[PDB]
Amino acid sequence: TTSAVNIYNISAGASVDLAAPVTTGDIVTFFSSALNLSNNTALNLLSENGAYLLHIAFRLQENVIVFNSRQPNAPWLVEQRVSNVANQFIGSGGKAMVTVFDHGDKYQVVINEKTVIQYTKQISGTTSSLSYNSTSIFSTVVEAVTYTGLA
Amino acid sequence: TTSAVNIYNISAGASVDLAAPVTTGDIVTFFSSALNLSAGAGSPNNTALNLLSENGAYLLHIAFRLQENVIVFNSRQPNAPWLVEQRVSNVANQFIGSGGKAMVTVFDHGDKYQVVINEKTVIQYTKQISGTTSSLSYNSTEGTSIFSTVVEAVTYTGLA
Ligand SMILES: CC(=O)N[C@@H]1[C@@H](O)[C@H](O[C@@H]2O[C@H](CO)[C@H](O)[C@H](O[C@H]3O[C@H](CO)[C@H](O)[C@H](O)[C@H]3NC(C)=O)[C@H]2O[C@@H]2O[C@@H](C)[C@@H](O)[C@@H](O)[C@@H]2O)[C@@H](CO)O[C@@H]1O
Ligand SMILES: CC(=O)N[C@@H]1[C@@H](O)[C@H](O[C@@H]2O[C@H](CO)[C@H](O)[C@H](O[C@H]3O[C@H](CO)[C@H](O)[C@H](O)[C@H]3NC(C)=O)[C@H]2O[C@@H]2O[C@@H](C)[C@@H](O)[C@@H](O)[C@@H]2O)[C@@H](CO)O[C@@H]1O
């Protein structure tokens, strides 16, 4: 078994195409060197045809994290919400880590050490690009590390 | 499937006991916020990162030796001789692109440990001792380290 590590720098308002796609069994971690909780910010996993397989939106004024999916050029699907943004980052200390495990029929999302949701997929497929949309809750550049070739 | 993420801060000359053990299919990554490749006075001493079993066996010992200009990979049972070394020459070449920081990732593939420095696979190490990793340690020979004085370790477990 030969696995791979790839590292990407993603600016706010930018996208990257992955050198190795993320599929069942694989992991993506996003690292932020800041945490500004004092504004809506999103991290996205996208398929090769531009579907949003997983959209994670942090909304500080509404005080929720929204999880959703959508096909390209079509309406958003059914939202899942987790309340109280700040309580999901307890113990952070000015930095943060967001990890997504692809478990096949679900995505597991972990903020630092805490599992926040087991999201049942509304669209299936392989992740081939990542994007970061925002004055952000995270640093202007976030680093993404993928671990692929695991299964 | 419920996987887990755990984060540890390891000072030079210290060790941690893991809350979730690392076994086949799992990952450990070490992060350093410095990389000291200097040659003269202030050059680093030999520095190692270790994966240990519950009885203190060294399942994987990774020794960075700047003056000898090798990375040594080995194992050993508690209080016994070291087993057969595997060596990779030219330390600085394994960190090209780093820019003052470094990531070291170990995948446990069951029969082998795969070791990756940043994005580059440096060895597929055939295990000489098998078992579960239950603690990590960081040794700089009580002197100057090649890495930052605190190294962060992240484990990903419950994968398979
Ligand atoms: C209670 C309820 O059902 N509210 C619904 C809103 O939550 C919903 O808002 C949209 O939600 C999407 C996830 O389900 C997604 O977060 C939308 O924003 C993203 O996508 C936009 C394109 O559609 C655009 O690219 C945004 O920039 C991006 N957001 C980020 C942070 O990347 C979100 O729609 C946006 O935000 C809301 C808050 C509102 O201002 C919209 O005008 C804006 O487009 C809407 C569905 O549109 O339905 C319910 O109201
Ligand atoms: C060419 C050849 O075969 N050289 C061999 C040396 O490489 C070997 O040195 C030991 O190698 C070990 C891995 O195979 C390991 O790195 C030893 O150092 C670690 O373990 C020590 C206890 O045995 C002690 O705890 C050290 O602090 C620790 N080092 C680190 C950085 O964690 C290493 O032995 C040490 O270093 C060598 C270079 C020498 O000074 C030894 O006196 C010293 O203990 C030796 C012994 O197996 O055999 C060949 O010479």
Author numbering:
A (entry chain B): 2 to 39, 46 to 141, 145 to 161
B (entry chain A): 2 to 161
Paper passage:
Here, selenomethionine derivatization and mercury soaking have been investigated for SFX experiments using the high-energy XFEL at the SPring-8 Angstrom Compact Free-Electron Laser (SACLA), Hyogo, Japan. Three successful cases are reported of single-wavelength anomalous diffraction (SAD) phasing using X-rays of less than 1 Å wavelength with reasonable numbers of diffraction patterns (13 000, 60 000 and 11 000). We succeeded in experimental phasing using SeMet-derivatization and Hg-soaking techniques at wavelengths of 0.954 and 0.984 Å, respectively. Such high-energy X-rays, which are essential for Se-SAD, allowed us to collect data at high resolution (1.4–1.6 Å) and perform SAD phasing with 11 000–60 000 indexed patterns.
SeMet-labeled ACG (Agrocybe cylindracea galectin) crystals belong to the space group P65 and have two monomers in the asymmetric unit. Each polypeptide consists of 178 residues and contains two Met residues; however, the first set of residues, including one Met residue, is disordered and the Bijvoet ratio is ∼2.2% at 13.0 keV. As the lattice symmetry (6/mmm) is higher than the Laue symmetry (6/m), there was a need to resolve the indexing ambiguity. The lower Bijvoet ratio and indexing ambiguity complicate the structure determination. Prior to merging using partialator, the twofold indexing ambiguity (hkl and ) was resolved using ambigator in the CrystFEL suite. We tested various numbers of patterns in the SAD phasing in the same way. At least 60 000 patterns (a mean multiplicity of 443.4 at 1.5 Å resolution) were required for SAD phase determination. The localization of Se sites required 35 000 patterns. The electron-density map from 60 000 patterns was readily interpretable. In the anomalous difference Fourier map, two Se sites with peak heights of 24.6σ and 24.1σ were identified. The number of patterns required for the ACG-Se case was much larger than others.
